[PDB]
Amino acid sequence: ARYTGPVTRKSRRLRTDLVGGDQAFEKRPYPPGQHGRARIKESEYLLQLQEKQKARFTYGVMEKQFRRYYEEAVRQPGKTGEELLKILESRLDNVIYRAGLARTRRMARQLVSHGHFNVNGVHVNVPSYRVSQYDIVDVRDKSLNTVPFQIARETAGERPIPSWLQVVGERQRVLIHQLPERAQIDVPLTEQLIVEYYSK
Amino acid sequence: NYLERVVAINRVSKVVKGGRRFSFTALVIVGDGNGMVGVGYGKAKEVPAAIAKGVEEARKSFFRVPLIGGTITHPVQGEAAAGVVLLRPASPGTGVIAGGAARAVLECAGVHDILAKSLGSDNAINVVHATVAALKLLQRPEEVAARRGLPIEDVAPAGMLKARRKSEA
Amino acid sequence: MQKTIVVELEDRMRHPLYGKIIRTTKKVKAHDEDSVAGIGDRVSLMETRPLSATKRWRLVEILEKAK
Amino acid sequence: PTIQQLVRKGRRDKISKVKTAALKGSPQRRGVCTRVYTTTPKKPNSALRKVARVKLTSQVEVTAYIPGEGHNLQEHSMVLVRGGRVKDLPGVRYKIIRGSLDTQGVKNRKQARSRYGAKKEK
Amino acid sequence: TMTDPIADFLTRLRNANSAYHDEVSLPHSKLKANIAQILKNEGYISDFRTEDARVGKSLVIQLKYGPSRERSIAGLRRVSKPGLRVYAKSTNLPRVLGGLGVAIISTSSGLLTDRQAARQGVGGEVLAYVW
RNA sequence: AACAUG
RNA sequence: UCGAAGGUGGGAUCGGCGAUUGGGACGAAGUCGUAACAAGGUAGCCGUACCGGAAGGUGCGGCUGGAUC
RNA sequence: CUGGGCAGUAACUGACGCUGAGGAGCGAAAGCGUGGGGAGCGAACAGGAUUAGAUACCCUGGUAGUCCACGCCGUAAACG
RNA sequence: AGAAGCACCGGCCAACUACGUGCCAGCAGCCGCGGUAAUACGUAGGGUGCGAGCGUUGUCCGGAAUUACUGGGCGUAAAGAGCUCGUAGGUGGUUUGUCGCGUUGUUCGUGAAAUCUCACGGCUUAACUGUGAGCGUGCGGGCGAUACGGGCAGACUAGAGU
RNA sequence: CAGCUUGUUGGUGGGGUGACGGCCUACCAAGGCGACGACGGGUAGCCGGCCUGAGAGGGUGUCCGGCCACACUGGGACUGA
Ligand SMILES: [Mg+2]
Ligand SMILES: [Mg+2]
Ligand SMILES: [Mg+2]
Ligand SMILES: [Mg+2]
Ligand SMILES: [Mg+2]
Ligand SMILES: [Mg+2]
Ligand SMILES: [Mg+2]
Ligand SMILES: [Mg+2]
Ligand SMILES: [Mg+2]
Ligand SMILES: [Mg+2]
Ligand SMILES: [Mg+2]
Ligand SMILES: [Mg+2]
Ligand SMILES: [Mg+2]
Ligand SMILES: [Mg+2]
Ligand SMILES: [Mg+2]
Ligand SMILES: [Mg+2]
Ligand SMILES: [Mg+2]
Ligand SMILES: [Mg+2]
Ligand SMILES: [Mg+2]
Ligand SMILES: [Mg+2]
Ligand SMILES: [Mg+2]
Ligand SMILES: [Mg+2]
Ligand SMILES: [Mg+2]
Ligand SMILES: [Mg+2]
Ligand SMILES: [Mg+2]
Ligand SMILES: [Mg+2]
Ligand SMILES: [Mg+2]
Ligand SMILES: [Mg+2]
Ligand SMILES: [Mg+2]
Ligand SMILES: [Mg+2]
Ligand SMILES: [Mg+2]
Ligand SMILES: [Mg+2]
Ligand SMILES: [Mg+2]
Ligand SMILES: [Mg+2]
Ligand SMILES: [Mg+2]
Ligand SMILES: [Mg+2]
Ligand SMILES: [Mg+2]
Ligand SMILES: [Mg+2]
Ligand SMILES: [Mg+2]
Ligand SMILES: [Mg+2]
Ligand SMILES: [Mg+2]
Ligand SMILES: [Mg+2]
Ligand SMILES: [Mg+2]
Ligand SMILES: [Mg+2]
Ligand SMILES: [Mg+2]
Ligand SMILES: [Mg+2]
Ligand SMILES: [Mg+2]
Ligand SMILES: [Mg+2]
Ligand SMILES: [Mg+2]
Ligand SMILES: [Mg+2]
Ligand SMILES: [Mg+2]
Ligand SMILES: [Mg+2]
Ligand SMILES: [Mg+2]
Ligand SMILES: [Mg+2]
Ligand SMILES: [Mg+2]
């Protein structure tokens, strides 16, 4: 399943603009609904819960899928917030967002879901495909000379590209240098209140 | 600028010839966020006046908490009246696994990697005093070498000495 | 018991949950080819094939008999 | 106490009662539902509670509670009995599942509607 | 009666450390004297000597305090009681205050600490903790 | 002496 | 010879029912006293005996977990 | 007639110690059996008072019992 | 373009107002809510948590240090036998020598495969599956160590007794 | 649930079996087992594992894999490695 609902509504409740650029948000940054302008009780559980929601609606991950990402992140060496945001940053629909081929996250998900891409010459259509080190991310020859793929040819500049991946010229393809560590991760959220959420 | 958490606000009652006279107590934690924390009880006829006597009491009772760069140095077990709090260090990926009363004492003190378990009574006032009693039992690696007259390299394990090198370089 | 001896062996082993070393004692039967063994008598044994319903041991030799 | 006492006499876990008997392993258990009647609750909290004395296929006779408002149980309706205890009724540990063998679901439900038994809309 | 003289040895050290006494005397044995050598080499006590009583001998330990009245010994715990003996292997030796303390280990190569038995790869009976 | 109850 | 099943016999052992009867828990606005909590109006509790509608009373020994001048 | 304790001497023995499930013995008072004894006291009981009642408290009497010999009982707020 | 629902919103525990009802009808896991302005009953709007599912019942562990080895207690909260003697049993002062049973080191044999942990590979990804290494806490055989515990052979006088 | 045991415990000579053996038989001896729970009673296929738990533990034995037991109930042998 997906969410398939209003997107500004879950940025107002979480008090954080999750998509890139929104004029509906910042006219009302307070939570939606009819009791929205309240000064609410900030529980310790509320600060851990709403921090976990900030990552599910940034990346578009259901709860059972997001929990399995936590299962291996707590189980790998290093930290837990480092490795949870790493394996969320390695999903294919997030890689397409960081490379500039899509304006938002939800249009990055369809272009992977509708099968407009390859990775190692292999046709893929799964949005939670996790890329690894040295993975080329190619693109279908049918998907060239298409409107959403050529409307993102001239808009290659307004968003920055992170250091761990790289885009090239008119043969559009994305090269993964290594897995992203921490510093080149975009931060709307802290990474310790998610770890403290699953200890309850 | 400091960190503050109110832990409990209960309403207490005194009996007179007329009836019952009510009052509020408000246990407050005030901390540096880095290495210092203070506990102050405070009580008054109204809740914001009971909080403000607690904040002014907690700031006149700071104490320094020995850290390594995210966690405490060795496991301790503290004893209040009948509250028993077991503190225990942890890896840097851990958060603060602690109950709601001992969470406020450790987050205000600047602790990031803790395992805590409260083993005695469930009173929030005595769990806070038992967490404070365990933080006094902590003692530094450079202070346990001056206490023994040895260097630090043979009183402390090498695995936590490198966590001093990594924490500030 | 007419060419048969009874020997009290003993062995000590940890308790599985508590860790204390518990001392217990068995009682095995053994074969005397000639009936020379009385009460007391540290005896050495070696286990054999079934010789009766219960005898599985043989007497090797007597070291430091009954004082 | 004194490890040699624990060697001789170990630790014995304390005894808890079978907290829902008369189902005997089953999650639900059907019955015949004689004697539909109405009981008062305890010292506070007064109303008219709608209960029934159901004879199960566990070969036991239990008092069971009917949640929702309005029912159609008379004397020999097949009911499906689950567990669940009612605090103000002292001898009552079982509820009747609504939307079952003969128990019609509660009419005019539009909230929560899966308890109490109700299809969505026609 | 008198069971476990090593637990008496540590209780005498606690009851005078807690009372800020400068020294303790106690009956001598070669196991108490060798435990005093591990306590001196790890810096918990100052020098000890052997006087002579009526019968037997006497072990006298000079305790150590700071410039201020600081206990140079924090705790003492007996681990391997005579009612329950405690043995450890070289791969899972115990660890006192995360390594800030010292466990007295009785190996076949003499009395050692954790750090003297870990790098020699031996285990034995875990006598005491000091920290 | 004496005097229960709500 | 042994031998399953069956027959006969006297016991053992675990359940159900049983006229009548012993207490137990809980029901509301029942009836009769007021024994304990204040020196609770005779300080109270404990063991035991006898007695009494009922709580309880009295003896004998004991305890303070009472003794308020 | 008989049991235990303390101190001194250090004469002798050479760890002979501590604890002790079960078991055994002792164990206030009341009570039980047989046989004595019975001043005073005093359950039960009886009368008098008090009271709405008074199977109580208070008063006058009063049996067992309290004592002894020999057994049984094995309980106490047997408590520091 | 052919394809969204289910529970909950007094506290724990994320999410609040209106109308209807008036100790009624009902709710409820616990404390409890309802007797005319009910955030707790019924509907509505709004909201939260999840999602091809969502609740409920049953059952087990967790929380529960409420059987406590890790890791509890017994003056008054539940808990020291009325008191002693003593059987089995458990435990045992100082010291020499010895044995190597306990203990400890090492090596061999064994502890199947799967499952589980880790790292790579393959199914478009995942579940799933292939390989490698751990793990398999142990047990048996061999060879080292002798501090402690124990056995055996003596010494000692401080405990105990005379 | 506190006394169980007479082929019972041991020996000798025969018999028997693929094999040791009271496995069977005769004779002789008078033993064997038990408060470290005998003899009874109740329940249960055991395990690799599975679920839970920080661990130690507690619960469990379903798929798959191992061994065992049975084949309407009870008893028996035949054939054959
Ligand atoms: Mg103060
Ligand atoms: Mg305590
Ligand atoms: Mg508690
Ligand atoms: Mg009857
Ligand atoms: Mg009265
Ligand atoms: Mg009275
Ligand atoms: Mg009166
Ligand atoms: Mg009175
Ligand atoms: Mg009378
Ligand atoms: Mg009396
Ligand atoms: Mg008296
Ligand atoms: Mg001599
Ligand atoms: Mg004794
Ligand atoms: Mg006894
Ligand atoms: Mg007597
Ligand atoms: Mg008498
Ligand atoms: Mg008499
Ligand atoms: Mg007479
Ligand atoms: Mg009269
Ligand atoms: Mg009189
Ligand atoms: Mg009589
Ligand atoms: Mg006499
Ligand atoms: Mg007395
Ligand atoms: Mg809330
Ligand atoms: Mg209203
Ligand atoms: Mg509602
Ligand atoms: Mg799904
Ligand atoms: Mg349940
Ligand atoms: Mg539970
Ligand atoms: Mg537990
Ligand atoms: Mg307790
Ligand atoms: Mg005690
Ligand atoms: Mg009391
Ligand atoms: Mg008590
Ligand atoms: Mg006593
Ligand atoms: Mg008694
Ligand atoms: Mg003895
Ligand atoms: Mg010794
Ligand atoms: Mg011994
Ligand atoms: Mg394997
Ligand atoms: Mg894989
Ligand atoms: Mg792959
Ligand atoms: Mg596999
Ligand atoms: Mg070996
Ligand atoms: Mg003497
Ligand atoms: Mg015969
Ligand atoms: Mg023979
Ligand atoms: Mg033969
Ligand atoms: Mg024969
Ligand atoms: Mg069966
Ligand atoms: Mg636990
Ligand atoms: Mg199976
Ligand atoms: Mg099957
Ligand atoms: Mg059939
Ligand atoms: Mg044949």
Short mmCIF file of C-alpha atoms (C1' of nucleotides) in Angstrom, two decimals, chain G:
data_model
loop_
_atom_site.label_atom_id
_atom_site.label_comp_id
_atom_site.label_asym_id
_atom_site.label_seq_id
_atom_site.Cartn_x
_atom_site.Cartn_y
_atom_site.Cartn_z
"C1'" U G 1 3.81 -76.99 31.02
"C1'" C G 2 2.89 -71.89 29.81
"C1'" G G 3 -0.97 -69.11 27.93
"C1'" A G 4 -5.12 -64.30 25.88
"C1'" A G 5 -10.28 -63.72 26.61
"C1'" G G 6 -13.98 -65.17 30.00
"C1'" G G 7 -15.98 -66.95 35.21
"C1'" U G 8 -16.02 -66.57 40.67
"C1'" G G 9 -14.45 -64.09 45.15
"C1'" G G 10 -12.68 -60.58 48.89
"C1'" G G 11 -10.28 -56.07 49.22
"C1'" A G 12 -7.90 -51.25 47.44
"C1'" U G 13 -8.55 -46.61 45.03
"C1'" C G 14 -10.73 -42.13 42.30
"C1'" G G 15 -15.45 -39.64 41.02
"C1'" G G 16 -21.15 -38.38 40.71
"C1'" C G 17 -25.99 -38.28 43.13
"C1'" G G 18 -28.32 -38.26 48.31
"C1'" A G 19 -33.75 -36.92 52.37
"C1'" U G 20 -31.44 -34.23 56.28
"C1'" U G 21 -27.62 -31.28 58.39
"C1'" G G 22 -22.52 -28.14 59.45
"C1'" G G 23 -20.35 -23.82 58.56
"C1'" G G 24 -18.56 -19.94 54.43
"C1'" A G 25 -18.88 -15.71 51.11
"C1'" C G 26 -22.07 -11.91 49.38
"C1'" G G 27 -26.77 -9.34 48.89
"C1'" A G 28 -30.99 -3.50 50.68
"C1'" A G 29 -34.07 0.83 53.15
"C1'" G G 30 -34.90 -6.10 57.85
"C1'" U G 31 -34.94 -7.60 63.49
"C1'" C G 32 -32.30 -7.66 68.53
"C1'" G G 33 -28.54 -5.88 71.49
"C1'" U G 34 -23.46 -2.63 71.80
"C1'" A G 35 -18.38 -6.41 72.15
"C1'" A G 36 -13.80 -3.61 69.99
"C1'" C G 37 -11.47 1.70 68.55
"C1'" A G 38 -10.96 7.41 73.74
"C1'" A G 39 -9.48 5.10 80.60
"C1'" G G 40 -14.60 3.03 74.42
"C1'" G G 41 -17.09 3.92 79.92
"C1'" U G 42 -15.36 -3.26 83.69
"C1'" A G 43 -7.85 -1.32 79.82
"C1'" G G 44 -7.34 -4.77 75.73
"C1'" C G 45 -5.32 -8.95 73.53
"C1'" C G 46 -3.08 -14.57 73.99
"C1'" G G 47 -3.55 -19.93 75.80
"C1'" U G 48 -7.19 -22.92 78.38
"C1'" A G 49 -11.78 -24.20 81.19
"C1'" C G 50 -16.96 -23.69 82.18
"C1'" C G 51 -21.29 -20.87 81.13
"C1'" G G 52 -24.69 -17.68 78.08
"C1'" G G 53 -30.22 -15.48 72.56
"C1'" A G 54 -26.09 -13.15 70.22
"C1'" A G 55 -21.86 -10.43 70.27
"C1'" G G 56 -19.66 -12.09 74.93
"C1'" G G 57 -19.22 -12.98 80.63
"C1'" U G 58 -16.18 -15.14 84.65
"C1'" G G 59 -11.97 -17.93 86.67
"C1'" C G 60 -6.34 -19.22 86.23
"C1'" G G 61 -1.63 -17.97 84.18
"C1'" G G 62 0.77 -14.57 80.87
"C1'" C G 63 2.06 -9.98 77.61
"C1'" U G 64 2.22 -4.27 76.91
"C1'" G G 65 1.15 -4.16 71.29
"C1'" G G 66 -2.30 -0.04 78.33
"C1'" A G 67 -2.22 2.32 82.69
"C1'" U G 68 -3.01 9.43 81.41
"C1'" C G 69 -2.79 10.46 89.09
#
